[PDB]
Design a protein around this ligand. Structure first.
Ligand SMILES: Cc1cc2nc3c(=O)[nH]c(=O)nc-3n(C[C@H](O)[C@H](O)[C@H](O)COP(=O)(O)O)c2cc1C
Ligand code: SF4
Ligand code: SF4
Ligand code: SF4
Ligand code: FES
Ligand code: FES
Lengths: 82, 31, 210, 688, 428
């Protein structure tokens, strides 16, 4: 099963606008629907946006969100959650 | 012919502070 | 003597001391002489008042002044140690202070000091066993023209001679307080032989106005 | 612009009005001699050593105090200036005692250096020197006042930086004496720094006295872990031993000072120290063994167990590398009960958003704030340098401070809004009088000490504080680039653990008692052997044998913060790394190395073999942990508040009491502090 | 024009200096105080400052700084803060006793001076700082102040001028240093009498952080008479920049020590013979004189036969009319012992704040104590001189100058005596 989601994004870069607006839009409705699942939003300057997902016995799978849009980020989050 | 400043021959130890307290009424409101 | 405090049975942070009610009225009068706030300015007059009430400034007296004026106690310790008219050790009933600076020494203050110490059977800086007299050496006390000169408490006895000093010490020893001022027959600061200046009537209220 | 032109030996330099002659000379490069002047303190002008000659002027000015004027030519190598310096040095040295061999300011003495450079080479003073009497000023500071030069840096520091008003100058003339008129004790959380500011050796440290000379010591640059401030420090080492701890200038954190605990707790590192692997608690008493044996037993137990039956606790002095190593190990075992000793509300957004648990305004923004609300905290005894910054702002940039907690002496005037957690709702709804100040405030702050969060109503407290913060933002109309909500931490590893995702609070451990506990420097005593099953097999992994070590089926000695290169994040989110000063004592090994070796001995092997690979793992987990000395900003506190609103809890009516209510409680907090001897002396002196 | 002295009693400002006329308001009005004060006040501050300037009055305290110029620094447009006029009645200079008489025999002169000077400076109050020793003089001063308050001359609207003025009397304790401007301000503020750094100057930040002007008792007390009788009348006396009448305290070895008032620039011989009777044992039995107070260096009989009591004249003679406290010594005196006592005075009175004076006045005291006995050696006179020059220009306050100058005067005019005493000591 899934144990974590870790969303890394840039504080203010063109390639992280989709992720940044995804947080503002859908983050609340996701943390209020999967209350027991951590969703660690960690930002760092000049970082490459990348979603991190850790499953059962310490198996972590990564994707990319650079230059992706809000709906694409939401689709990726839904796919990892399902 | 005769010395006039004799009133200080009777001042007690509290004369200064008594005079200051008396002037406290005349003193104008502080800033 | 010393600028560090060591507690003893007397002069202890708990040794009794407090202003009388009339002294509290005087304290209010003193404090109201400075702008709002800025009341720490009264530390000097208030501490002098405490000394006038007691006779010397015990650590309890310093702490009480600091508390009533709302200043850190170190701000009062600094003042008490810095200024020389503040007595941090008990002083005799009459505090004799013989001026010794050059203008008086030239007019023989040494003889006055010698006669005083010989009469009181003490050395400069010591208290009489009766706790009645304390002899110290002080710098200029103003009135350098009436030299040699001494101060007993708040009075000036000046133009002194050995006979005069031992006589005004006899009066204090017994009773009564000798009248202050020069004892040389000249009232004060004037030329001894005779006036050489303001020897004619002063002029009217409007003399010489533009 | 509004800049004036001045000449330093003819070298034109641009300086704004108000710049002093000393600062103009510094801009050019010349370093005028000085004693009494300090950059962080008020100018005094006592020593007169900084006298310099202004061209076509009669007398010499005091460079430290004289404001420069247009067209002035400052001659620094002139005959008049050099003769003034020689005379001033002669006067300084006239009454000085010949104590150089037995003086702790051996090779660090500014009087020595400036006598060699700017003074004369002989003495014509043919009299008897004065001799002041020494005074007892507590167990931490030794007073050899005969060396004092009456510079008054100590007095100024105590009056301004520490706000204690205990030291002063008594008497006058050549008999002037610096100290407490009475037999006071100079006890404060910042008392030690007087030792640094004393230019001569009049004030020195009792624990360090006579031990070594400056030219011998090797100066390493590391970070303090006695609190969440992260005070940059310099560790002085001589032949593989810590000689003393000194401050390191960091304008954004330290500012040259360090707390008394940070300074004087280094003694603990040399006592009650775990120095060898130790096992066999089931057979009776703990007995020494070897790494390959203790790790074999640990690996056997780990292989036997799995799932939530295994759990870990991180507490106090732990490093991000060890935390991530342990997290990866337990995850590979399929466990997630890796907790930390200090609680944090995890009901709202919890640790999902970094803005929910960081001093978002940073330490240095206090000077930019207008109003400060200290909620249920005692800044003086937790984050003493944060309290120092608050006092600096209050003293200089007119600041206002209010406290919603127990009334304690913070060293500055503040409004006591009461010690009830319902005042938060009162302020939020506008029923309290403090809203009047909050109205005209422009740059508010609402600090919330974690000590308050560690109550059983911490969730309610945090929800209330955030809900008040939202209304403060809307009414005050503060920009989006000014963060008001802050949380002040008191544990070094709390922020790093939260970033790595450790579950705050040890609640899941009690919910599902594990069959194998993994204590990693967990001396807080939150979980005892009474909890857990009847044969839990606890594993202690730390440097000191304190509360945790006795309860254990195996001890694995780790390294202290002075012996390992470790990443520590402070309360404001800044990531900093220490440097290896000493080497681990005996068979002790780095904590992340021990974890990785245990992994490899077990079936599960971790994918790092070097510090840099562990750092890359940290980058993968939380990117900000590897950007050193850089404070990444944060966002979505609107989202944090949105999620907090939905939390349904009520603030218990109990008073908001700080755990450290008096100075006596400041000196014992960590394992090192509890094992320190000097801290015990300080505790006894305060209690007396 | 030339040849000064023989001031007529018509022109003496202090007409009760000797105390044989009533000093209370009743006698002060008879002698001419508080006359046309309302007119003087309503003539404005600019007119008063102009009168003081054109009079040429120079600060009667230690250093002589033009009074009009010094008081004009507070005539600047209001900054919204109160302005104060602090009167420096801490007569601490050894040999000086003139302020004592001005305060105990003519307090109303000082009080009206406070009023007019406060109007000129724009001040609202005027704290008088008087020694703690001068208890009876402070008591007389407050009796006079209360008389003024009760007569309406001060308070709500002074003399009907509509100007609000208050006179506060503040007593210090034992401290010669508290006569210094900034030290006096600090003492009033309640802290230790330790001089501040300059700049900022008192006229910019003063007592309680507001503008202030420290003035001598004589300087403030002369002002009402200057205003009434015209600045030109005051300028009539004296040479040029040294204008006015001065109170002289002739003390030491003189037949009739006295406090007298005389024309500025009166010859020293005339001052010592006409009023004080003459140096004990005749003019020939004269060794040296200290024209100023104690901070002024000596002048030997050779230089004092023709010196003129003036700022410029004594500066030319290498001394300075500090406070005009003539101290006379008559040959029989032990000159080095007397100067050693003066240096001991400065050692006792130094505040101790700043290193030059703190650590160098004690050095000079020790060396001078050795010199009095001859224990030192002739090569040490130049060491003492060099120490004096090191101390002179490097102190925060002028007390360092005052401690250095007497030693320089001794080393400059009586070096052979020092060498003779050292030789006699070495002969044992
Ligand atoms: C150590 C020291 C002691 C002093 N005592 C006195 C005094 O009794 N009266 C006085 O007018 N000035 C005294 N002064 C000088 C004052 O600082 C200041 O120059 C004077 O009060 C200004 O008054 P004026 O402008 O009328 O001259 C002293 C200065 C120093 C440095
Ligand atoms: S402070 Fe110490 S090292 Fe420096 S000169 Fe004095 S005794 Fe010598
Ligand atoms: S003890 Fe040290 S810091 Fe304090 S005044 Fe003396 S030399 Fe300066
Ligand atoms: S010169 Fe002497 S009295 Fe004046 S400030 Fe310096 S130490 Fe104090
Ligand atoms: S020298 Fe003695 S009163 Fe002045
Ligand atoms: S450094 Fe300027 S006087 Fe001390």
């Amino acid at each position: 099963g899934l144990r974590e989601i870790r969303v890394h994004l840039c504080q203010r870069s063109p390639g992280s606008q989709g992720v940044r607006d995804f947080i503002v839009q859908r983050y609340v409705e996701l943390k209020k629907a999967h209350p027991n699942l951590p969703i660690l939003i960690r930002e760092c300057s000049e970082v490459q946006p990348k979603l991190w997902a850790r499953y059962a016995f310490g198996q972590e799978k990564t994707v990319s969100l650079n230059n992706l849009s809000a709906d694409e980020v939401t689709r990726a989050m839904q796919n990892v959650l399902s | 012919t005769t010395y006039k400043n004799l009133q200080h021959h009777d001042y007690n130890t509290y004369t200064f502070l008594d005079l200051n307290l008396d002037l406290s009424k005349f003193r104008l409101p502080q800033p | 003597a010393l600028f560090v405090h060591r507690d003893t049975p007397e002069n202890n942070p708990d040794t009794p001391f407090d202003f009388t009610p009339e002294n509290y009225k005087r304290i209010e009068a003193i404090v109201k002489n400075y702008p709002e706030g800025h009341q720490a300015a009264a530390v000097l007059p208030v501490l002098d008042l405490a000394q006038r009430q007691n006779g010397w400034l015990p650590i309890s007296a310093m702490n009480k002044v600091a508390e009533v004026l709302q200043v850190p106690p170190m701000r009062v310790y600094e003042v008490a140690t810095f200024y020389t008219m503040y007595n941090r050790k008990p002083v005799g009933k009459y505090h004799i202070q013989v001026c010794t600076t050059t203008p008086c020494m030239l007019r023989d203050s040494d003889s006055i000091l010698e006669t005083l110490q010989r009469k009181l059977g003490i050395k400069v800086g010591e208290t009489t066993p009766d706790k009645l007299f304390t002899l110290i050496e002080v710098e200029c006390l103003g009135a350098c023209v009436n030299a040699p000169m001494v101060q007993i408490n708040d009075n000036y006895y000046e133009d002194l001679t050995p006979k005069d000093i031992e006589e005004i010490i006899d009066e204090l020893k017994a009773g009564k307080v000798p009248k202050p001022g020069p004892r040389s027959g000249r009232f004060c600061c004037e030329p001894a032989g005779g006036l050489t200046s303001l020897t004619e009537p002063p002029k009217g209220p409007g003399f010489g106005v533009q | 612009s509004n800049l004036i032109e001045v000449f330093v030996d003819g070298q034109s330099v641009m300086v704004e009005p108000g710049t002093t002659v000393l600062q103009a000379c510094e801009k050019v490069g010349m370093q005028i001699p000085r004693f009494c002047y300090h950059e962080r303190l008020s100018v005094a002008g006592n020593c007169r050593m900084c006298l310099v000659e202004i061209e076509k002027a009669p007398k010499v000015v005091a460079a430290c105090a004289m404001p420069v004027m247009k067209g002035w030519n400052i001659l620094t190598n002139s005959e008049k200036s050099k003769k003034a310096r020689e005379g001033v040095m002669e006067f300084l040295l006239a009454n000085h005692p010949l104590d150089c061999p037995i003086c702790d300011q051996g090779g660090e003495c500014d009087l020595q250096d400036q006598s060699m450079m700017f003074g004369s080479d002989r003495s014509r003073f043919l009299e008897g020197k004065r001799a002041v009497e020494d005074k007892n000023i507590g167990p931490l500071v030794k007073t050899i006042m005969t060396r004092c030069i009456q510079c008054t840096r100590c007095i100024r520091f105590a009056s301004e930086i520490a706000g204690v008003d205990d030291l002063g100058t008594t008497g006058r003339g050549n008999d002037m004496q610096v100290g407490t008129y009475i037999e006071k004790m100079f006890m404060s959380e910042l008392s030690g720094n007087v030792i640094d500011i004393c230019p001569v050796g009049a004030l020195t440290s009792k624990p360090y006295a006579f031990t070594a000379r400056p030219w011998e010591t090797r100066k390493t640059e590391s970070i303090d872990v006695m609190d969440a401030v992260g005070s940059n420090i310099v560790v002085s080492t001589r032949t593989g031993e810590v000689m003393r701890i000194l401050p390191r200038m960091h304008e954004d954190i330290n500012e040259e000072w360090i707390s008394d605990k940070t300074r004087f707790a280094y003694d603990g590192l040399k006592r009650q120290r775990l120095t060898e692997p130790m096992v066999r608690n089931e057979k009776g008493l703990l007995t020494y063994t070897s790494w390959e044996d203790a790790l074999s037993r640990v690996a056997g137990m780990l292989q036997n167990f799995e799932g939530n039956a295994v759990a870990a606790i991180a507490g106090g002095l732990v490093d991000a590398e060890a935390l991530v190593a342990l997290k990866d190990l337990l995850n590979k075992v399929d466990s997630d009960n890796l907790c930390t000793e200090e609680i944090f509300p995890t009901e709202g957004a919890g640790t999902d958003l970094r803005s929910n648990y960081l001093l978002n305004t940073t330490i240095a923004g206090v000077e930019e704030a207008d109003v400060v609300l200290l909620v249920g905290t005692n800044p003086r005894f937790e984050a003493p340098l944060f309290n120092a910054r608050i006092r600096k702002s209050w003293l200089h940039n007119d600041l206002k401070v209010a406290l919603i907690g127990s009334p304690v002496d913070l060293t500055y005037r503040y409004d006591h809004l009461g010690d009830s957690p319902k005042i938060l709702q009162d302020i939020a709804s506008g029923r309290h009088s403090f809203c009047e100040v909050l109205k005209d405030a422009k740059k508010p702050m609402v600090v919330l000490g974690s000590s308050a969060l560690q109550r059983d109503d911490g969730a309610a407290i945090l929800v209330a504080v955030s809900n008040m913060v939202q209304k403060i933002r809307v009414t005050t109309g503060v920009a989006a680039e000014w963060k008001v909500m802050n949380i002040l931490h008191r544990i070094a590893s709390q922020v790093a653990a939260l970033d790595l995702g450790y579950k705050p609070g040890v609640e899941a451990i009690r919910k599902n008692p594990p069959k194998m506990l993994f204590l990693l420097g967990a001396d807080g005593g939150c979980i005892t052997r009474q909890d857990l099953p009847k044969d839990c097999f606890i594993v202690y992994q730390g440097h000191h044998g304190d509360v945790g070590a006795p309860m254990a089926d195996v001890i694995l000695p780790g390294a202290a913060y002075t012996e390992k290169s470790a990443t520590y994040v402070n309360t404001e989110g800044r990531a900093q790394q220490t440097k290896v000063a000493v080497t681990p004592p005996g068979l002790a090994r780095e904590d992340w190395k021990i974890i990785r070796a245990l992994s490899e001995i077990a079936g599960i092997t971790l994918p790092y073999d070097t510090l840099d690979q562990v750092r890359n793992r940290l980058e993968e987990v939380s990117p900000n942990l590897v950007r050193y000395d850089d404070i990444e900003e944060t966002n979505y506190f609107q989202q944090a508040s949105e999620l907090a609103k939905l939390v349904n809890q009520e603030v218990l009516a109990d008073p908001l009491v700080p755990p450290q209510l008096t100075i006596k409680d400041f000196y014992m907090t960590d394992s090192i502090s509890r094992a320190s001897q000097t801290m015990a002396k300080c505790v006894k002196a305060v209690t007396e | 024009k030339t040849s000064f002295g023989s001031l007529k009693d018509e022109d003496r400002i202090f007409t009760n200096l000797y105390g044989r006329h009533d000093w209370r308001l009743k006698g002060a009005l008879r002698r001419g105080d508080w006359y046309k004060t309302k007119e003087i006040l309503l003539k404005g501050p600019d007119w008063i400052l102009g009168e003081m300037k054109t009079s040429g009055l120079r600060g009667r305290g230690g250093a002589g700084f033009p009074t009009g110029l010094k008081w004009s620094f507070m005539n600047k447009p209001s900054d919204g803060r109160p302005k104060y006029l602090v009167v420096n009645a801490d007569e601490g200079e050894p040999g000086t006793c003139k302020d004592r008489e001005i305060m105990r025999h003519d307090p109303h002169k000082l009080v009206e001076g406070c009023l007019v000077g406060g109007r000129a400076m724009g001040a609202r109050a005027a704290y008088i700082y008087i020694r703690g020793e001068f208890y009876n003089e402070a008591s007389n001063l407050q009796v006079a102040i209360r008389e003024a308050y009760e007569a309406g001359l001060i308070g709500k609207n002074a003399c009907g001028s509509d100007y609000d003025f208050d006179v506060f009397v503040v007593r210090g304790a034992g401290a010669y240093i508290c006569g210094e401007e900034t030290a006096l301000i600090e003492s009033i503020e309640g802290k230790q009498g330790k001089p501040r750094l300059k700049p900022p100057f008192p006229a910019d930040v003063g007592v309680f952080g507001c503008p202030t002007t420290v003035a001598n008792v004589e300087t403030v007390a002369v002002s009402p008479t200057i205003c009434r009788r015209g600045g030109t009348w005051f300028a009539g006396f004296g040479r040029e920049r040294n204008s006015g009448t001065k109170l002289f305290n002739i003390s030491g070895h003189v037949n009739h020590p006295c406090t007298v008032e005389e024309e500025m620039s009166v010859p020293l011989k005339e001052l010592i013979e006409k009023h004080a009777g003459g140096v004990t044992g005749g003019w020939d039995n004269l060794l040296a004189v200290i024209p100023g107070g104690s901070s002024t260096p000596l002048i030997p009989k050779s230089v004092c036969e023709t010196v003129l009591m003036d700022f410029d004249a004594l500066v030319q003679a290498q001394t300075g009319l500090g406070t005009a406290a003539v101290i006379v010594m008559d040959r029989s005196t032990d000159i080095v012992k007397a100067i050693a006592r003066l240096i001991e005075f400065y050692k006792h009175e130094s505040c101790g704040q700043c290193t030059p004076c703190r650590e160098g006045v004690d050095w000079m005291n020790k060396v001078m104590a050795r010199f009095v006995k001859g224990d030192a050696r002739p090569a040490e006179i130049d060491s003492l001189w060099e120490i004096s020059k090191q101390i002179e220009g490097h102190t925060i306050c002028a007390l360092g100058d005052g401690a250095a100058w007497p030693v320089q005067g001794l080393i400059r005019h009586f070096r052979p005596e020092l060498e003779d005493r050292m030789q006699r000591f070495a002969q044992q």
